[PDB]
Amino acid sequence: EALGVDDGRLLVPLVLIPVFIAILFSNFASTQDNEDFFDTYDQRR
Amino acid sequence: SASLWERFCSWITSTDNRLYIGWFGVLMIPTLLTATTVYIIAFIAAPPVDIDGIREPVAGSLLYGNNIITGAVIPSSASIGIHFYPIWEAASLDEWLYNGGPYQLIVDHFLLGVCGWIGREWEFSYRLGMRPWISVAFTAPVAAASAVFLVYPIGQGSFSDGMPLGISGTFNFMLVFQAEHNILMHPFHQLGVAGVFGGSLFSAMHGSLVTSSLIRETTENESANYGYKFGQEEETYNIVAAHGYFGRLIFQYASFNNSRALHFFLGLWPVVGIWFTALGIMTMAFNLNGFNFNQSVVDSQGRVINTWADILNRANLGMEVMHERNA
Amino acid sequence: MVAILQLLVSMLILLSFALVVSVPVILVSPGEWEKSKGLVYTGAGLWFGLVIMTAAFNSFV
Amino acid sequence: RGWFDLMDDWLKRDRFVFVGWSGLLLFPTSYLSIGGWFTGTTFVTSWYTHGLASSYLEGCNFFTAAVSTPANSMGHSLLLLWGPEAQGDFTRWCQIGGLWAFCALHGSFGLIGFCLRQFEIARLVGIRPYNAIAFSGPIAIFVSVFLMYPLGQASWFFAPSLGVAAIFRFLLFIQGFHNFTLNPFHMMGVAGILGAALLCAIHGATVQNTIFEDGDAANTFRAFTPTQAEETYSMVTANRFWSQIFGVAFSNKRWLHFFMLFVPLAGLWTSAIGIVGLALNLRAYDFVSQELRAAEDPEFETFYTKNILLNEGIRSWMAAQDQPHENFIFPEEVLPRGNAL
Amino acid sequence: MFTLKIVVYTTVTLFVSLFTFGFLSNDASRNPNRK
Amino acid sequence: NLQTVAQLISLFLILTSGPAIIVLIALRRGNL
Amino acid sequence: PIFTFRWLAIHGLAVPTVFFLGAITSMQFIQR
Amino acid sequence: AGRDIESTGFAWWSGNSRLINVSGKLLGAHVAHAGLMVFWCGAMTLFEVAHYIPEKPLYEQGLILLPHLATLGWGVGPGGEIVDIYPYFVVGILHIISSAVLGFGGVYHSLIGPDTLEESFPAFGYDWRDKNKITTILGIHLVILGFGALLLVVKAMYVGGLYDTWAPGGGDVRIIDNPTLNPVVIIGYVLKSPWGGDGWIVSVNNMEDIVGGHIWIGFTCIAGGFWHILTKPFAWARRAYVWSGEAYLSYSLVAVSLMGFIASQYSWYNNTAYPSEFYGPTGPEASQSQAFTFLVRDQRLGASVASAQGPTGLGKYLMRSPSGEIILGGETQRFWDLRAPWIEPLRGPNGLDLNKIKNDIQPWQERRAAEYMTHAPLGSFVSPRSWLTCAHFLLGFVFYIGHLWHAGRARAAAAGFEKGINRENEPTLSLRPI
Amino acid sequence: YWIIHSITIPALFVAGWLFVSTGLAYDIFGTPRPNEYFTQERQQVPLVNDRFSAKQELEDLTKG
Amino acid sequence: KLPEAYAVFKPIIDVAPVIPVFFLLLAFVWQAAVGFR
């Protein structure tokens, strides 16, 4: 059951891959200015 | 540029690619390609599928005695119902092919792909700085496809009731749907017919009026299409002349003087019609069938005087008995 | 005991109709709500009183 | 000037409704056809031709009321009111289905008059006559379906009756007796109609979503004026969008509008060819190889064979009431059924 | 059948994660009017 | 039927109550 | 005035239209 | 003026778009629409109780709100029979009377109330771009929703209880003493597959799970409301979303579209939160009831070409499931996933047990099966389940359309080209061809 | 406008009403009344069989 | 069936649920009153 996960090994792609990409995304996120802007969207990128 | 992920994002959302990918395309391309190749392989060489679940398979593949017209990807077995049936949930690959698993694979990946196509149309509209409502127009065929492929099996309880991925299978789906639900008498299919007929009429009318009032920018020895240059800032046809012709063909009041309003109506009419017919299919999936005017006329003695609706019901009954192989 | 309740809720319906017609007209109109501000208060109070009285008499019926 | 010149001047006057020379044919014929259809759907019965009630006087609604085709006893007769069938009797003329012939003939001449009206208005305005060539599509549809098909068949009886449920019955009858969905010309017609609807929707959305910001208002319908020398939408942006979204895009507006004209017209003409083929029972009903395979292999079944069985069911379970003149009497044992196949 | 399932899960998770984190990477700023 | 008459009268009064507000606002020349 | 193309076409539409509306309204109250 | 296209740029048919940047009139419009909803609820409840025929069941009279009130336990006795309609009348009266107050509030805040709120009531004003204030309003309304869920829980456990179809010998109004507060069950329901045989959250088949899940939902909503009141959106959230009224509207639109699809599936399939004594049997329920009635009429007597074990391998109207379990045979094989109270006592570890049907069958089960066979949503009467499912599926689809429209326009307006292409600096003219 | 149309239009509507209520439509258009779909001798559907004797055949069928 | 005291008010209740539709129409009437400005 759960997310179609009838074998524990299936949890390895479902966690390691989202984390790894997130780590890459972290290198993006730390680069961006994370201050408030008070606008409809943030043009700083 | 700043980071590896930033470079990947710049490449994904780049307008310099021959075909725009975008984040919606990141989901659209794999699903659409998978569904395409599985559909081709199944249409060429799939084994026959026991669609009715009573151990009498139906062939729909070219290698099993079908042509292009009669070939189809047979819907999943009635024993499967609407159970999720991937390859790994079948005991063997032969069992998966025998129960119509490739139909479920193609349908699911194709629905994901068309949702990604809607999102990708919006995404490239946003990237180009244009207005985003082309995807709203494209929702109508997507809605119709989801109604004939997903919503109707959900309401009926089996993917075997879905439309087969073929030509003769499509005709069989239409005939069985008419027999079961009398879709011709359903007002939403009537609205869809009005939508498609009006779309054809309005496309022909708009093309005729624009082509009729083409401003002379060419000689007799060449095609008139060369009178228009790509990227030119001037209008290639006289709106006033076409408006006058249309307002003289009918009464003066009936005309679309505003070109933007005319094109908005052109976009609106068939999209609304297809939306209505998709909604009708969705409603009839839960047995909200069309109008029933059977036995609407009787004489003084009480005998039923038949109408054209009675003849339509006779045809529907003739189809119904053939479709139901059981009592 | 039933006729009194029927008359009471009929009066409530009439007062609800009158308030629905009058209150937006009184409030929006620049002329009204200055010489007739208390009329709205009296009408709303009478409406709530009629509601309470109907709820009371519904019990005996 | 002469009398002809003065009449031409009067017919060409800029009135609220243009008359023209073509009006002398269009207005009376179209008016009579529409009035006859209303009269038939309101008062005239089909009891003596089809054994059916099709009129508001008999209790029918908008869907079930129709101007039914003449009786099969009549051949391809013109069914003139003064003709030998009616002999001047209006009641007998209405009872035998002569009002259907009235509507069909005056409506065909009304379509001819409207096509001539399009030609005349195009000539007077001073534009190319790409209307009345687009209308040739509907003209061919009407000629093939309401005129050529019954003429190829036994009588006017098998023509479509002028009604909603009558048209639905005609659809199912043609499917049962001809397998018209399997006809390739009908397939080309379906492709043309669906592609024309697609073109209309996609062109409208593309123009609405590529407009230039020519106004300060959020609602952009006011930003256009007819006396504009500039295009109201960006063709370059639309071409880029559809070239990087679909892989191909229009770059010529004239070619795009000619294509939007051409697709429904070609579809209608192909469907007209298919219906003309049906008129002589020259139908793409069956595939011989598939029938031979199914005959020598009871375990061979495709959706085409299921369609053949469905068409057999429509024919047998409707023949009795759809063709009452034939006096078809089919026992329950001979009626095909899914059970005991 | 398990190896096919793990491959499909890996592929789907990768593509869904790419989609999710791509639309989280300030997608609104990727417009021609951004300064 | 008397109940049909009552339904018609109530429907007429409800349908009148709507435009009556607009008419009164127009008579008093308020913000319409 | 008395005779105009617009006038004649309007009456050719309307005189049958009102006649047919009366006929259909009568059909609505038939015993059927 | 602000009420014309000249001063706003919006035509009359888009006129409520003029309410985006004025707060008081927007609040009045929302309160007026809420009053409309409450008025419809009360009026339709009064209409249904005015047309209620005591002998007929609820699902045979085209009623949709009375089944909702009966599921809550009001005016219903054992077996789903309706005792009195007075509590339904009270519910309708209370809604239709509170509608007057809500309508007055909407009219006041729309017409004569201030157009903007921040200049006079700073505690209620907003800008659609002050993320902290919008999150505070979201948190307050989240607390309200959580308290509503806890109110349903209190009704379930303290005030009267809820109707349960799974009570022995037919459904009955029962107090839910011990709801399922175990997080594993709730998470498994949330993470369950939505396909056939699993059903995701639609397949909740007992009242204890419903009450426990609503406990979790209420407390989670209260906690999230306090969180959003006391916090500000994080850096990843700020850079990902458009911060404007139309964007929030589009988010709500897609949320309610998904909710409408879920509710349509709930009405079509679920027979626990939608009892079959009030909404009628489901389509699978009707088909399986017809098959079970035929099986019973074969076991008794036996002249219907079934007198012994000679036909098939098992008894008549029996076959084996794809996983090997014993199920009802025939065209109803696709509906073997149905679980209904009148058929559960006849089902064992391997499925339907023939001897248990022969001996341990009850007359009320036969009566339920026959009455559900008579009224079939698919066929054997338009079921109220069909009306609810079709209506809310259509609403979900059209609100997905609305979400797409409003989200695209919010993106275009935030970027700044929702009125068209600039024609002075055209974006595609700067891009190189191909 | 309204002066002429306040007399002609209601009179025309009443004439259309009386065209049906007085039974003139059935006589003019040959539409059978609800009590004369099947005669005592002919309980079947009446159908014309010959085109050149259609008038006489309809006279025979509609005589009763 | 309504209670005994409230039976005579069945017609108005029957008119009640279709009131919101009129509200929509009323809005259009208001837009008709101001000239669709």
Ligand code: CLA
């Ligand atoms: C339920 C839906 C709904 C709601 C709540 C609103 C609400 C509002 N609209 Mg919108 N609108 C709607 C539908 C809706 N509209 C539709 C469908 C259209 C298209 C036709 C419009 C078109 C539209 C435009 C074009 C504009 C608005 C504007 C407004 C605002 C003020 C209107 C005004 O000046 O009233 C004036 C109306 C009157 C004086 C007459 C009606 C009087 C009252 C309201 C009748 C209520 C009857 C009720 C029974 C009374 C109960 C009394 C109580 C004590 C019980 C208000 C917030 C305007 C605005 O503020 O923009 C800035 C504006 O410009 N709307």
Ligand code: CLA
């Ligand atoms: C209507 C209710 C509501 C709304 C509009 C919001 C809105 C918001 N919240 Mg809040 N929140 C809520 C309720 C709500 N919250 C509740 C009840 C809780 C308690 C659990 C929280 C706890 C919470 C935290 C702790 C945080 C937010 C944050 C946010 C912001 C970004 C959220 C985001 O990107 O989603 C992201 C969504 C996902 C990653 C998807 C998760 C889905 C989970 C795994 C369940 C999946 C179920 C199912 C399998 C898939 C969906 C099926 C569907 C059909 C139901 C946004 C302002 C964030 C923020 O910036 O604020 C500071 C943040 O950090 N919220």
Ligand code: CLA
């Ligand atoms: C909670 C939901 C919600 C909210 C608050 C809004 C709010 C808004 N929308 Mg959005 N929208 C929604 C849902 C929503 N919409 C959905 C679900 C759809 C898909 C159908 C749309 C499609 C949509 C479009 C296409 C547009 C908007 C626009 C607007 C704005 C102006 C609306 C207006 O003036 O109405 C005016 C009201 C009318 C003209 C009345 C329409 C009546 C409909 C067509 C009849 C439907 C049948 C009816 C219910 C049955 C009654 C029968 C009766 C006729 C007898 C406003 C910001 C417009 C805008 O300015 O964008 C910012 C715009 O262009 N919306």
Ligand SMILES: CC1=CCCC(C)(C)[C@H]1/C=C/C(C)=C/C=C/C(C)=C/C=C/C=C(C)/C=C/C=C(C)/C=C/C1=C(C)CCCC1(C)C
């Ligand atoms: C409510 C409703 C819902 C949806 C919207 C809606 C559609 C707008 C609306 C419908 C409203 C409705 C119901 C509208 C209906 C309108 C109607 C019924 C109009 C009827 C017109 C009749 C005509 C023109 C007949 C003329 C007779 C002629 C020419 C005779 C010809 C003769 C014949 C027989 C042949 C021999 C020759 C002669 C003698 C010449």
Ligand SMILES: CC1=CCCC(C)(C)[C@H]1/C=C/C(C)=C/C=C/C(C)=C/C=C/C=C(C)/C=C/C=C(C)/C=C/C1=C(C)CCCC1(C)C
């Ligand atoms: C085509 C056309 C023509 C012109 C242009 C157009 C405007 C666009 C269009 C209009 C078309 C149309 C058809 C416009 C029609 C518009 C109409 C008739 C609108 C009527 C609205 C009535 C309302 C809102 C009643 C509210 C009463 C209440 C709440 C009180 C109720 C009750 C009372 C008795 C008291 C208490 C009990 C209860 C039950 C509560």
Ligand SMILES: CC1=CCCC(C)(C)[C@H]1/C=C/C(C)=C/C=C/C(C)=C/C=C/C=C(C)/C=C/C=C(C)/C=C/C1=C(C)CCCC1(C)C
């Ligand atoms: C703002 C806006 C601007 C322009 C556009 C717009 C849409 C036109 C407008 C919206 C305006 C809007 C939407 C305004 C909103 C208006 C609303 C929803 C008004 C509600 C009125 C309900 C009443 C009076 C019912 C009272 C019930 C009673 C007395 C029950 C009695 C019962 C008792 C006691 C016992 C039993 C019997 C009964 C009789 C049944």
Ligand SMILES: [Cl-]
């Ligand atoms: Cl079949």
Ligand SMILES: [Cl-]
């Ligand atoms: Cl069966």
Ligand SMILES: [Fe+2]
């Ligand atoms: Fe165009």
Ligand SMILES: [Mn+2]
């Ligand atoms: Mn089915």
Ligand SMILES: [Mn+2]
């Ligand atoms: Mn069937």
